[PDB]
């Protein structure tokens, strides 16, 4: 049967004949991927229903065609992933179905095990670590979120940090430097950055930066004659 | 068309065979129902007004969950014959849940569906009448094929199959000279070379380039062509070429290998020439990240061109085949345009009312430009243009980078695409990015923009485009700085920072080694030859590669022209702008071409950036 030159009819006559484990070989030899995944859907609805796994694991090693057909079912890719041991590739799909409904940070924990007892790479121990501080940003942001009730909650440092400088907490804001390392240089010319965005002159008294300030005031907005001649 | 590619010859065929559809539908009132990646396509070849008046329809909608809703308003009036529905499968190989909704809930008693499909040549015209009944049913083709192709899925409701398989083949829609054929998108949206999803690339890739080969097989048959020299660049391209050698060598009829012996064969030829140069993407990041500076360049990366060649936000078509002052300044610099209208302008007066009209719009919409390039996020524009020329030519030092960076980060607003496209080129022209700047610029990045960042930051530092100093799909490996030398890419040039494109040169070395016998060289094989050849030029491309295998050249036959350069990969459109220029140049010199480039869908920097996340 498989000495055949018309690529569809051997492939017809292997199937038929019972022997449904080597024309998927075949299919995969001549690269078609057309006749390939009509194969597979036939030969899925006519079996126990689960020797599929057991037919895929062994046969057809990685080639995640079936898995490219099911993408919007995130019912099928859950199962077989979990069997198959393949966490990150559930970590990755929970990460994606997080990322819909507008919510990370409730999958987050899971992504902090998915990751973990992993034994496999270092790239993923700089993740860990990113993990580890976005923990740490987490609980701060729960520790001096509740003390004033602002409303806070998800965000980032910068859109904590613009709206902690207005009104800030001295001794406080800056206490957070020392704890994330932040740098000196991008702190600098910020707080001037979250004030005169609104109506105002503080900067005057910061006084204890650089050139780059000098052309920010020149941009937004008149009033020149501060620190004309410091240079 | 007959050894003769008339491009826009190719339009028409595609138009008269959905017509014959349609109107052989049904003589009564129609309303068609169009899948929404399918249709601004559609739109682009025919219009409103004679689709109306070649066939009944009159009624046009899209596939939405709004039609459910609609289903009791819109589907259930209206209805006056039956409802045609046109989907794509071509690529994702699943049918959309919309119409499997609507089969069930509104209980249509009609099922007819259109498919496309590319044009099946080897159907070699019904093949006769049948062979006079196939020679007493000699032939049959009862059963002698699978059940069902991708639809096979569709065994539920009713029996109404009435498929309608409409054929498409590609045409020219942005320019006369290149043809484009849309493989490189799904209906999610979902880039087709660089997915967000890094577990299923393989699968991915064999689609995209099975579909190609397709495309390109399609096209061959139709044209009747004969391939004689090949001259593949990477990993994937070999694989496309066996491929398409294979097919080619397999699926050909007969009363054409006769042809093959008596044209061209053993001891004699007849001096008919046909190239297929193939390049990937993925050889040269250097230069789909660059800022265009042409005019159609400047007016994409700007507001985005759909499917169809148009825009949202104006109403007019930029379409070839009705207007001629588009033609003129489409891809001239933006620079000359001004004094150009001015004097086109200014003609006219001494000397219909649609020239008037075409030349009030383009008047506007260049002021219109001209306005929102400045006095939005001012002296931007220009700063990145500064940036990148110094970055390109390389004046990093140490830990100035990490200033500049932030410099423009709050001190003038800018988007997120900007800053991740030019700390892309920036890791990327150097070849290799110490380990002592990734946990700043990580920690920066993760620090303004979220947490989710850190995934991009990971996906993407795998495909290349983010690389640390401390099946290889084609990798750059070597030092920009050195290829300034070996090329003369950095001084003739447009639509760039002054800069030539690395395929620019890639593709010029094939034919003459002029630019490369400046620096390295003391003896070629030639100076000036027709045929395209490799030779001697291995060790350069073999530590730009780390592997002397990228280049593949293969000669098919045994023993004024027409060069197919296809583009796996998307175009970046300042290259059509220099293609033009080789054209004219090598034309010159004194080798006449002609170049027809084959695009699988645009691509540019920030529509690769949402790609990627």
Same mark, same amino acid.
């Given at each position: 049967?498989?000495?055949?030159?018309?690529?569809?009819?051997?492939?017809?006559?292997?199937?038929?004949?019972?022997?449904?484990?080597?024309?998927?070989?075949?299919?995969?030899?001549?690269?078609?991927?057309?006749?390939?995944?009509?194969?597979?859907?036939?030969?899925?609805?006519?079996?126990?229903?689960?020797?599929?796994?057991?037919?895929?694991?062994?046969?057809?090693?990685?080639?995640?065609?079936?898995?490219?057909?099911?993408?919007?079912?995130?019912?099928?890719?859950?199962?077989?992933?979990?069997?198959?041991?393949?966490?990150?590739?559930?970590?990755?799909?929970?990460?994606?179905?997080?990322?819909?409904?507008?919510?990370?940070?409730?999958?987050?924990?899971?992504?902090?095990?998915?990751?973990?007892?992993?034994?496999?790479?270092?790239?993923?121990?700089?993740?860990?670590?990113?993990?580890?501080?976005?923990?740490?940003?987490?609980?701060?942001?729960?520790?001096?979120?509740?003390?004033?009730?602002?409303?806070?909650?998800?965000?980032?440092?910068?859109?904590?940090?613009?709206?902690?400088?207005?009104?800030?907490?001295?001794?406080?804001?800056?206490?957070?430097?020392?704890?994330?390392?932040?740098?000196?240089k991008?702190?600098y010319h910020?707080?001037?950055?979250?004030?005169?965005?609104?109506?105002?002159?503080?900067?005057?008294?910061?006084?204890?930066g650089y050139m780059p300030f000098y052309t920010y005031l020149k941009?937004?907005?008149?009033?020149?004659?501060?620190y004309?001649?410091m240079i | 068309?007959?050894?003769?590619?008339?491009?826009?010859?190719?339009?028409?065929?595609?138009?008269?065979?959905?017509?014959?559809?349609?109107?052989?539908?049904?003589?009564?009132?129609?309303?068609?129902?169009?899948?929404?990646?399918?249709?601004?396509?559609?739109?682009?070849?025919?219009?409103?007004?004679?689709?109306?008046?070649?066939?009944?329809?009159?009624?046009?909608?899209?596939?939405?969950?709004?039609?459910?809703?609609?289903?009791?308003?819109?589907?259930?009036?209206?209805?006056?014959?039956?409802?045609?529905?046109?989907?794509?499968?071509?690529?994702?190989?699943?049918?959309?849940?919309?119409?499997?909704?609507?089969?069930?809930?509104?209980?249509?008693?009609?099922?007819?569906?259109?498919?496309?499909?590319?044009?099946?040549?080897?159907?070699?015209? $019904?093949?006769?009448?049948?062979?006079?009944?196939?020679?007493?049913?000699?032939?049959?083709?009862?059963?002698?094929?699978?059940?069902?192709?991708?639809?096979?899925?569709?065994?539920?409701?009713?029996?109404?199959?009435?498929?309608?398989?409409?054929?498409?083949?590609?045409?020219?829609?942005?320019?006369?000279?290149?043809?484009?054929?849309?493989?490189?998108?799904?209906?999610?949206?979902?880039?087709?070379?660089?997915?967000?999803?890094?577990?299923?690339?393989?699968?991915?890739?064999?689609?995209?380039?099975?579909?190609?080969?397709?495309?390109?097989?399609?096209?061959?048959?139709?044209?009747?062509?004969?391939?004689?020299?090949?001259?593949?660049?990477?990993?994937?391209?070999?694989?496309?070429?066996?491929?398409?050698?294979?097919?080619?060598?397999?699926?050909?009829?007969?009363?054409?290998?006769?042809?093959?012996?008596?044209?061209?064969?053993?001891?004699?030829?007849?001096?008919?020439?046909?190239?297929?140069?193939?390049?990937?993407? /993925?050889?040269?990041?250097?230069?789909?990240?660059?800022?265009?500076?042409?005019?159609?360049?400047?007016?994409?990366?700007?507001?985005?061109?759909?499917?169809?060649?148009?825009?949202?936000?104006?109403?007019?078509?930029?379409?070839?085949?009705?207007?001629?002052?588009?033609?003129?300044?489409?891809?001239?610099?933006?620079?000359?345009?001004?004094?150009?209208? /001015?004097?086109?302008?200014?003609?006219?007066?001494?000397?219909?009312?649609?020239?008037?009209?075409?030349?009030?719009?383009?008047?506007?919409?260049?002021?219109?430009?001209?306005?929102?390039?400045?006095?939005?996020?001012?002296?931007?524009?220009?700063?990145?243009?500064?940036?990148?020329?110094?970055?390109?030519?390389?004046?990093?030092?140490?830990?100035?980078?990490?200033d500049?960076?932030?410099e423009?980060?709050?001190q003038?607003?800018?988007?997120?695409?900007?800053?991740?496209?030019?700390?892309?080129?920036?890791?990327?022209?150097?070849?290799?990015?110490?380990?002592?700047?990734?946990?700043?610029?990580?920690?920066?990045?993760?620090?303004?923009?979220?947490?989710?960042?850190?995934?991009?930051?990971?996906?993407?530092?795998?495909?290349?485009?983010?690389?640390?100093?401390?099946?290889?799909?084609?990798?750059?490996?070597?030092?920009?700085?050195?290829?300034?030398?070996?090329?003369?890419?950095?001084?003739?040039?447009?639509?760039?920072?002054?800069?030539?494109?690395?395929?620019?040169?890639?593709?010029?070395? $094939?034919?003459?080694?002029?630019?490369?016998?400046?620096?390295?060289?003391?003896?070629?094989?030639?100076?000036?030859?027709?045929?395209?050849?490799?030779?001697?030029?291995?060790?350069?491309?073999?530590?730009?590669?780390?592997?002397?295998?990228?280049?593949?050249?293969?000669?098919?036959?045994?023993?004024?022209?027409?060069?197919?350069?296809?583009?796996?990969?998307?175009?970046?459109?300042?290259?059509?702008?220099?293609?033009?220029?080789?054209?004219?140049?090598?034309?010159?010199?004194?080798?006449?071409?002609?170049?027809?480039?084959?695009?699988?869908?645009?691509?540019?920097?920030?529509?690769?950036?949402?790609?990627?996340?």
């Open positions: 049967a498989l000495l055949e030159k018309n690529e569809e009819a051997r492939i017809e006559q292997l199937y038929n004949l019972d022997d449904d484990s080597i024309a998927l070989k075949e299919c995969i030899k001549v690269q078609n991927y057309s006749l390939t995944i009509s194969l597979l859907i036939a030969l899925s609805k006519k079996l126990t229903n689960s020797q599929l796994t057991k037919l895929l694991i062994i046969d057809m090693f990685n080639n995640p065609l079936y898995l490219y057909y099911m993408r919007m079912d995130k019912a099928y890719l859950y199962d077989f992933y979990r069997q198959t041991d393949r966490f990150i590739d559930l970590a990755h799909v929970l990460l994606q179905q997080g990322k819909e409904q507008q919510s990370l940070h409730s999958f987050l924990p899971q992504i902090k095990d998915l990751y973990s007892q992993v034994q496999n790479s270092e790239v993923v121990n700089n993740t860990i670590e990113q993990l580890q501080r976005q923990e740490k940003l987490w609980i701060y942001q729960e520790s001096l979120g509740k003390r004033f009730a602002i409303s806070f909650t998800n965000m980032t440092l910068d859109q904590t940090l613009s709206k902690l400088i207005e009104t800030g907490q001295d001794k406080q804001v800056k206490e957070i430097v020392k704890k994330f390392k932040i740098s000196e991008k702190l910020l707080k001037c950055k979250t004030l005169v965005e609104a109506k105002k002159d503080e900067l005057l008294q910061f006084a204890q941009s937004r907005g008149d009033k020149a004659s501060p004309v001649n | 068309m007959n050894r003769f590619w008339n491009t826009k010859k190719f339009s028409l065929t595609n138009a008269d065979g959905l017509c014959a559809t349609l109107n052989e539908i049904s003589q009564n009132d129609e309303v068609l129902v169009v899948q929404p990646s399918v249709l601004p396509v559609l739109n682009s070849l025919l219009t409103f007004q004679d689709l109306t008046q070649s066939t009944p329809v009159r009624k046009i909608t899209l596939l939405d969950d709004q039609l459910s809703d609609d289903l009791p308003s819109a589907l259930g009036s209206v209805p006056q014959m039956d409802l045609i529905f046109l989907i794509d499968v071509r690529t994702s190989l699943r049918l959309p849940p919309q119409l499997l909704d609507a089969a069930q809930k509104h209980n249509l008693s009609s099922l007819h569906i259109i498919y496309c499909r590319w044009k099946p040549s080897f159907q070699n015209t $019904l093949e006769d009448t049948e062979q006079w009944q196939k020679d007493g049913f000699d032939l049959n083709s009862k059963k002698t094929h699978f059940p069902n192709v991708i639809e096979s899925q569709l065994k539920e409701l009713s029996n109404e199959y009435t498929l309608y398989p409409w054929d498409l083949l590609p045409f020219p829609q942005i320019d006369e000279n290149v043809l484009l054929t849309h493989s490189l998108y799904n209906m999610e949206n979902v880039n087709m070379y660089y997915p967000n999803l890094r577990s299923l690339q393989s699968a991915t890739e064999s689609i995209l380039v099975d579909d190609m080969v397709n495309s390109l097989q399609s096209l061959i048959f139709e044209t009747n062509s004969i391939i004689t020299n090949v001259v593949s660049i990477g990993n994937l391209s070999k694989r496309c070429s066996h491929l398409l050698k294979k097919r080619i060598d397999e699926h050909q009829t007969e009363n054409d290998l006769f042809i093959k012996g008596t044209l061209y064969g053993e001891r004699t030829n007849c001096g008919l020439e046909m190239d297929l140069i193939i390049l990937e993407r /993925n050889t040269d990041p250097i230069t789909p990240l660059l800022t265009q500076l042409t005019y159609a360049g400047i007016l994409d990366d700007l507001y985005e061109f759909n499917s169809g060649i148009k825009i949202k936000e104006k109403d007019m078509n930029f379409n070839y085949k009705e207007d001629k002052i588009w033609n003129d300044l489409k891809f001239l610099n933006f620079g000359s345009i001004g004094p150009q209208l /001015n004097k086109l302008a200014k003609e006219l007066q001494t000397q219909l009312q649609q020239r008037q009209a075409f030349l009030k719009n383009h008047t506007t919409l260049s002021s219109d430009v001209l306005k929102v390039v400045e006095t939005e996020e001012y002296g931007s524009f220009n700063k990145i243009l500064e940036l990148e020329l110094e970055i390109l030519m390389g004046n990093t030092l140490n830990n100035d980078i990490e500049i960076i932030l423009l980060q709050y003038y607003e800018v988007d997120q695409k900007k800053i991740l496209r030019l700390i892309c080129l920036l890791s990327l022209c150097k070849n290799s990015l110490r380990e002592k700047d990734y946990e700043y610029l990580r920690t920066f990045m993760i620090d303004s923009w979220g947490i989710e960042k850190c995934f991009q930051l990971e996906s993407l530092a795998e495909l290349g485009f983010f690389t640390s100093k401390t099946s290889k799909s084609t990798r750059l490996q070597k030092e920009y700085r050195y290829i300034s030398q070996w090329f003369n890419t950095v001084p003739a040039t447009f639509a760039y920072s002054g800069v030539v494109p690395l395929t620019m040169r890639l593709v010029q070395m $094939l034919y003459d080694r002029s630019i490369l016998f400046h620096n390295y060289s003391s003896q070629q094989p030639f100076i000036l030859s027709r045929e395209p050849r490799v030779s001697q030029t291995e060790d350069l491309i073999e530590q730009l590669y780390g592997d002397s295998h990228a280049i593949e050249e293969s000669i098919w036959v045994p023993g004024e022209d027409i060069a197919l350069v296809v583009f796996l990969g998307g175009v970046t459109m300042g290259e059509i702008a220099i293609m033009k220029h080789l054209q004219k140049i090598l034309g010159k010199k004194g080798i006449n071409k002609r170049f027809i480039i084959i695009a699988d869908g645009l691509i540019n920097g920030t529509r690769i950036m949402n790609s990627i996340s």
